[PDB]
Amino acid sequence: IVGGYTCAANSIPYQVSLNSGSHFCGGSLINSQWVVSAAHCYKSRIQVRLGEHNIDVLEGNEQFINAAKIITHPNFNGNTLDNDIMLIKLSSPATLNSRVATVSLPRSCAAAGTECLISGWGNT
Amino acid sequence: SSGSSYPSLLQCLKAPVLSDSSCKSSYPGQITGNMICVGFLEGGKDSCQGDSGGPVVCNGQLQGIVSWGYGCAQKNKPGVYTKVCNYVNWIQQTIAAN
Ligand SMILES: [Ca+2]
Numbered sequence A: 001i002v003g004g005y006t007c008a009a010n011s012i013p014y015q016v017s018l019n020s021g022s023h024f025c026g027g028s029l030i031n032s033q034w035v036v037s038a039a040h041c042y043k044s045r046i047q048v049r050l051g052e053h054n055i056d057v058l059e060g061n062e063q064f065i066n067a068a069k070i071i072t073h074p075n076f077n078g079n080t081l082d083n084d085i086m087l088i089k090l091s092s093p094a095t096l097n098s099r100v101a102t103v104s105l106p107r108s109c110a111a112a113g114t115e116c117l118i119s120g121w122g123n124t
Numbered sequence B: 001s002s003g004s005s006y007p008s009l010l011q012c013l014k015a016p017v018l019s020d021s022s023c024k025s026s027y028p029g030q031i032t033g034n035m036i037c038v039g040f041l042e043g044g045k046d047s048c049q050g051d052s053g054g055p056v057v058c059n060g061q062l063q064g065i066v067s068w069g070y071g072c073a074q075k076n077k078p079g080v081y082t083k084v085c086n087y088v089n090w091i092q093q094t095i096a097a098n
Helices: B020-026 B088-096
Strands: A015-019 A023-031 A034-037 A047-050 A063-072 A086-090 A115-120 B011-016 B035-038 B055-058 B061-068 B079-083
Touching (some): A023 A047, A023 B055, A023 B088, A034 B061, B020 B035, B035 B061
Antiparallel strands (some): A015 A023, A015 A047, A023 A034, A063 A086, A115 B011, A115 B055, B035 B079, B055 B061, B061 B079
């Protein structure tokens, strides 16, 4: 995130970090077993790190759960990034609490001009 | 772990959904109906490498997944996001069967 601010710790409780040695992508927890992410973040093995704020320091709210299934959209186009969506099944259910929570799927598309919240550990 | 260039702490950004005509004119020939632009045409504020897969949440609902862009925070090159309101059935049915 370029030009953002630091989120209040654990104020984005649906945000996860995808880790294969180090952080490489984000995701969103949509139920206790499933993270939605981007298909171009696919790796054959992924550790999902929930409850994170500082991804370099153990703070005490983290849950580290390896993926059991990684499902890219069948019509993902790796050249154009069309259908860039992926689902990750946790090998055990996350424990939902005040720092690890789900985000609702949309009930309709957002209107142009709607204000949204974007988050991640990407380059600043 | 954040390695060479990522931040340690989770970053946040408030940004508006952009019109489809703004999106297509920012990225001629590259925008499908499964993509939405979110951000600022004046640049300066955007998602970037390492953010992909992460959320765009509007009014409590996941509307976007960080996907791609030309550069980061560049003028007339807002972030391009996977349009989640196209995929609720894919998501629910894939979860239900797996
Ligand atoms: Ca941590």
